[PDB]
Amino acid sequence: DFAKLEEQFDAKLGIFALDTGTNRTVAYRPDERFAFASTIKALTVGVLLQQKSIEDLNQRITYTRDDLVNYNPITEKHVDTGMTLKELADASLRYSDNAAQNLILKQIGGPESLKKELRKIGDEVTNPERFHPELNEVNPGETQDTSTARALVTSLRAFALEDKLPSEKRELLIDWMKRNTTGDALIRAGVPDGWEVADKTGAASYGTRNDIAIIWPPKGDPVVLAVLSSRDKKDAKYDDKLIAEATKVVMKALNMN
């Protein structure tokens, strides 16, 4: 079924899913690298949370037009007032605000700092190097700003569900991701209505289209999923339907739907 989706959508798919209740997995090219694009924003907030108290998220960040980049849906409205770190995390996660990601990344010490903190949580794969807009531009074979489906799942799980954060911080992260506005055509579109989904989307050059998520069936332990994709041509379009359909194959394979 994954090969058939690659054929229908002229794309390369990377899939990893873990049922945290059983330890069963679904995998298809799970260790192939893709540009992570804005899926990195979830791990970036994980690191922010780890390094701050919750009250410390109330720090107000002043910024200017020079901090705004290519896509600033929330941050462009608040240049005059600033935004708190909490507000920047909300913007980054729920709207994929690129300026918010760059401001958070600067607060935590820049891409190299983020990389060091990911290594500390056990991720030796994810390779943050650049800010937006450049991080979304990755050529075939390059490893800058890439990860794999397996590593993104492992890292997302570690922050949201395991012991890289204390419970109140896990809850912030999960609630922001559950209320994401950008993912309705992706993993959410392959999950029955009513099941809670926390997700973060991304897109990059070479038609890269990604979504990472935690899916809660009405009872029982959650599934952590990464669906990554890319194409042959630099300026290629993506199709969200590939990601929705891949998700439905994962849900069948896990006997959840």
Curated annotation (Swiss-Prot):
Post-translational note: Large exopenicillinase is the primary secretion product; it can be converted to small exopenicillinase.
GO cellular component: plasma membrane
Entry keyword set: Antibiotic resistance, Cell membrane, Hydrolase, Lipoprotein, Membrane, Palmitate, Signal
An individual GO BP term: response to antibiotic
Amino acids binding substrate: K200, T201, G202
Entry membrane topology: Lipid-anchor
Catalytic activity: a beta-lactam + H2O = a substituted beta-amino acid
Top enzyme class: hydrolase
One Gene Ontology term of the molecular function aspect: beta-lactamase activity
Inducing or repressing factors: By the bacillus licheniformis protein BlaR1.
EC id: 3.5.2.6
Additional note from the record: The class A beta-lactamase family has a specific amino-acid numbering system, sometimes called Ambler or ABL numbering and often misspelt as Amber. A multiple sequence alignment was used to derive a consensus sequence and then the consensus was numbered taking into account insertions and deletions. This allows use of identical numbers, e.g. for active site residues, despite differences in protein length. UniProt always uses natural numbering of residues, hence there appear to be differences in numbering between this entry and some papers.
Protein name: Beta-lactamase
Annotated organism of origin: Bacillus licheniformis
